[PDB]
Amino acid sequence: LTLKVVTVLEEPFVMVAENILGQPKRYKGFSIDVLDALAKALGFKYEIYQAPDGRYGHQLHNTSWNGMIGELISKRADLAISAITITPERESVVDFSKRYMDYSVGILIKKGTPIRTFQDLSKQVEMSYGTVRDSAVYEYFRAKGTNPLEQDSTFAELWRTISKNGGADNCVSSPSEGIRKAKKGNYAFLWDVAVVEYAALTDDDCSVTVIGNSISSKGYGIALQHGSPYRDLFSQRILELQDTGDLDVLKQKWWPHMGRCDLTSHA
Amino acid sequence: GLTLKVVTVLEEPFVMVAENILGQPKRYKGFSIDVLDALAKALGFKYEIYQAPDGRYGHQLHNTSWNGMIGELISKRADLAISAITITPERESVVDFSKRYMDYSVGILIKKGTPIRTFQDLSKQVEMSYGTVRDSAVYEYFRAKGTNPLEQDSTFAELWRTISKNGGADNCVSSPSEGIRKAKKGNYAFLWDVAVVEYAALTDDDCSVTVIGNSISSKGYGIALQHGSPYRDLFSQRILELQDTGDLDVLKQKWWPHMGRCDLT
Numbered sequence: 001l002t003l004k005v006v007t008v009l010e011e012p013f014v015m016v017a018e019n020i021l022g023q024p025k026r027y028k029g030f031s032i033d034v035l036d037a038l039a040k041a042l043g044f045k046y047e048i049y050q051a052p053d054g055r056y057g058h059q060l061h062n063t064s065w066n067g068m069i070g071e072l073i074s075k076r077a078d079l080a081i082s083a084i085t086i087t088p089e090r091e092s093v094v095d096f097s098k099r100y101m102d103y104s105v106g107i108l109i110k111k112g113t114p115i116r117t118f119q120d121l122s123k124q125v126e127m128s129y130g131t132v133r134d135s136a137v138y139e140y141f142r143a144k145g146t147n148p149l150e151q152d153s154t155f156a157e158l159w160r161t162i163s164k165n166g167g168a169d170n171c172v173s174s175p176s177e178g179i180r181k182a183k184k185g186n187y188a189f190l191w192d193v194a195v196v197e198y199a200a201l202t203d204d205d206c207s208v209t210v211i212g213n214s215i216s217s218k219g220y221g222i223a224l225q226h227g228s229p230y231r232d233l234f235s236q237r238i239l240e241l242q243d244t245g246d247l248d249v250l251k252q253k254w255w256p257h258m259g260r261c262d263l264t265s266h267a
Numbered sequence: 268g269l270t271l272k273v274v275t276v277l278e279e280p281f282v283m284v285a286e287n288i289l290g291q292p293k294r295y296k297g298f299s300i301d302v303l304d305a306l307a308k309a310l311g312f313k314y315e316i317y318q319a320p321d322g323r324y325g326h327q328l329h330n331t332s333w334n335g336m337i338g339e340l341i342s343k344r345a346d347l348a349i350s351a352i353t354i355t356p357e358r359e360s361v362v363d364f365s366k367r368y369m370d371y372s373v374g375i376l377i378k379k380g381t382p383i384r385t386f387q388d389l390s391k392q393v394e395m396s397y398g399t400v401r402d403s404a405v406y407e408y409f410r411a412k413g414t415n416p417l418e419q420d421s422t423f424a425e426l427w428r429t430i431s432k433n434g435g436a437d438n439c440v441s442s443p444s445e446g447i448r449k450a451k452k453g454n455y456a457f458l459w460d461v462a463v464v465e466y467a468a469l470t471d472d473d474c475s476v477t478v479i480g481n482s483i484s485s486k487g488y489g490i491a492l493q494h495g496s497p498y499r500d501l502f503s504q505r506i507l508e509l510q511d512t513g514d515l516d517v518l519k520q521k522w523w524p525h526m527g528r529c530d531l532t
């Protein structure tokens with residue numbers, strides 16, 4: 001039994017591993033290790049391919065999705081794994097396992113500013129900060145920033161800067177560009193805290209740090225086909241790997257704080 | 268119309284008794300009740316609630332049977348179980364949980380005015396009684412953590428030495444309501460759901476207690492259904508929708524009102 005796995009490159013969840021010339025691509029990372037653990041415990045083989053458009057996928061027309069979600073809908077893949085958050089729109093068309101890691105949004109910024117919280121960022125006048133335009137993060141801040149029911153003004157202030165002039169002034173086209181702009185200075189990039197944490201830990205110049213928050217609204221999941229017979233099985237083993245600590249060990253492996261950049265060097 | 272049988276246990280502010288006149292059935296209220304109400308409205312079912320006869324969440328016994336609400340689902344006396352139930356692998360093996368509708372972690376309830384401000388501070392205590400509910404999933408959590416040689420710091424082992432003293436008899440309590448009462452009295456720190464002890468501190472008549480959190484979240488609260496229940500996936504989808512729209516945040520603010528209540532700082 002061999003399962004067809006679709007993925008998208010994103011450090012440190014899924015990364016290209018060294019392969020000999022003339023031999024097929026290999027992959028490594030936190031999500032690969034989770035997948036391997038499931039394959040060993042459940043006893044299956046798998047083969048990986050990258051989404052032809054490199055996209056997680058969104059809806060274009062009724063039933064028309066691109067990206068990895070589209071690959072599952074058309075049943076070209078049995079499952080998708082990368083850094084995919086569990087959302088209701090995606091769960092209505094495919095079937096997610098229970099989460100194997102929590103997701104939240106963080107801030108990547110150069111070390112040495114007085115900014116230490118999301119509230120501090122929101123108080124900034126004239127400072128450029130933002131996220132990937134037309135992303136889920138963008139839409140999250142839209143919803144929180146236009147809702148009169150928020151207890152703290154923090155979200156309205158952040159959205160005013162992020163969305164300025166339609167999101168064209170302060171947002172970027174990709175996480176790699178956002179990471180690159182934050183390292184150069186005079187910009188703070190809002191994105192997956194796990195993604196920017198790894199970028200900060202491996203920064204050639206150890207020049208950046210990450211601000212997180214207590215607000216975790218979603219989990220990372222494995223996406224399977226609609227009606228897949230394996231979804232509940234994956235959920236059960238994922239709960240077991242969490243409870244034994246195997247997941248925490250893998251997280252420590254791929255987000256190692258010793259031997260890498262000190263994110264708290266300005267304290 | 269279609270009516271589901273719901274089993275629960277009382278834990279403030281998740282499920283609480285709301286009104287009980289003689290000649291009328293018990294009514295319930297709380298965060299978990301409002302989550303259940305939204306699912307009932309959206310999926311078109313009614314429901315009737317009863318309390319687990321042994322008042323337990325449920326765990327496995329030596330003959331592989333289960334007590335508590337879990338046992339009520341296995342026997343098919345209940346169609347679903349809801350209160351403040353954590354999704355664990357042992358339970359999911361015998362019942363089917365929705366995806367979580369809230370995150371869970373362990374906190375400490377303690378009187379204000381002590382130098383104890385973290386779990387590490389608590390673990391350093393020499394003379395002090397602190398613990399959790401005996402024979403609970405929280406007791407088993409500190410057992411697993413306290414006996415793990417792979418733990419980086421001695422904190423969990425030290426906590427376990429105090430919690431487990433004399434097989435747990437000395438420093439643990441029989442119920443959360445006993446743990447809360449003893450922390451409010453003083454000279455006892457109670458370890459339990461951060462959300463349960465936060466409500467106790469927010470609503471303290473004297474505003475005399477506080478909560479130490481900082482514990483990372485490993486688990487979620489879920490609704491438990493029978494094995495193979497056709498409603499598990501429908502519930503998960505609607506829960507994800509209630510989160511996405513902000514409705515679950517509104518309900519959390521309703522039942523954990525920070526403004527107008529005790530300052531915990």
Ligand SMILES: *[C@@H]1O[C@H](CO)[C@@H](O)[C@H](O)[C@H]1NC(C)=O
Nearest residue numbers: 327328329330331332333334
């Ligand atoms: C299993 O053990 C419990 C606790 O002693 C007991 O109440 C129950 O009747 C037992 N069930 C059997 C024999 O299946």
Ligand SMILES: [Ca+2]
Nearest residue numbers: 091092094095
């Ligand atoms: Ca689905």
Ligand SMILES: [Ca+2]
Nearest residue numbers: 359360362363
């Ligand atoms: Ca199950």
Ligand SMILES: [Ca+2]
Nearest residue numbers: 232495496500
């Ligand atoms: Ca099923």
Ligand SMILES: [Cl-]
Nearest residue numbers: 098099219366
């Ligand atoms: Cl989940």
Ligand SMILES: [Cl-]
Nearest residue numbers: 097098365366
């Ligand atoms: Cl699920």
